[PDB]
From a paper:
The LftR protein transcriptionally regulates the expression of the lmo0980 gene, which encodes a putative multidrug resistance transporter, LieAB (Listerial importer of ethidium bromide as artificial substrate), and facilitates the export of toxic chemicals from the cytoplasm to the extracellular space. As transcriptional regulators, PadR family members commonly contain a winged helix-turn-helix (wHTH) motif to interact with operator DNA. The apparent molecular weights of both LftR proteins were estimated to be 20–24 kDa, whereas the calculated molecular weights are ~12 kDa, indicating that LftR forms a homodimer in solution regardless of construct designs.
The LftRCtH protein was purified with the C-terminal His6 tag. The monomeric structures of LftRΔNtH and LftRCtH are mostly similar, but local structural differences are observed at the H0 helix and the β1 and β2 strands. Residues 4–8 form an α-helix (H0 helix) in the LftRΔNtH, whereas the corresponding region of LftRCtH adopts an extended coil structure, indicating the flexible nature of the LftR N-terminal residues. When the dimeric structures of LftRΔNtH and LftRCtH were superposed using the wHTH motifs of subunit A, the structures of subunit A were overlaid well, but those of subunit B were not superimposable due to severe positional displacements in the quaternary structures. As a result, the inter-wHTH distance of the LftRCtH dimer (~81 Å) is ~11 Å longer than that of the LftRΔNtH dimer (~70 Å). The cavity of the LftRCtH dimer structure (cavity surface, ~277 Å2; internal volume, ~148 Å3) is larger than the cavity of the LftRΔNtH dimer (cavity surface, ~157 Å2; internal volume, ~83 Å3) probably due to conformational changes in the dimerization residues. Noticeably, the comparative analysis of the LftRΔNtH and LftRCtH structures indicated that the cavity of LftR is flexible and can be modulated by intersubunit reorganization.
Residue numbers in the entry:
A (entry chain B), B (entry chain A): 7 to 104
Write the structure that this text describes.
């Protein structure tokens, strides 16, 4: 019911500390959005790197494979800023409709 | 970005006075989505009649074709309330994230 917000919901989670595909997927699941799988998140996480909106600290393990840790870039700091202003707008309009 | 709410927003308009396809579509254009088309509204109306959520007063003219006037059935009343409760639900959670 909100796949549009998913791209900005993720940047929201990344805005409050270094995080990883799993932790971000779990946080979305905890919010009530249990329909999504790890993969769906990573496939947006890849997209956000391509577009330049996240920064990457690749972290190694002797216990398993390497995980990526995600941070907002200045561009992503900006793009998230826009996303919310977009939300505020639409809620506000619906509000006056009601 | 609101093509799914379009059905509920129309029921919202029908809730405050008897009304007709054009007035509905114009009200929509006044709300802001000027991507709307008179046609797009009528198809939804037609579906709403068939779902049993609106009531028809067909009104004639010697000036041109007849126009159906729409008002809410008791079911449409119920259905619109369900939609608002849903917006409330989703606005609340989004804003909690925010």
């Amino acid at each position: 019911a909100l796949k549009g917000s998913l791209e900005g919901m993720i940047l929201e989670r990344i805005s409050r500390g270094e995080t990883y595909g799993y932790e971000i997927t779990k946080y979305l699941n905890d919010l009530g959005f249990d329909e999504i799988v790890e993969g769906t998140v990573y496939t947006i996480l890849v997209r956000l790197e391509k577009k330049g909106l996240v920064e990457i600290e690749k972290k190694k393990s002797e216990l398993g494979p390497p995980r990526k840790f995600y941070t907002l870039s200045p561009a992503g700091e900006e793009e998230l800023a826009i996303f919310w202003k977009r939300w505020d707008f639409i809620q506000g309009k619906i509000m006056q409709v009601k």
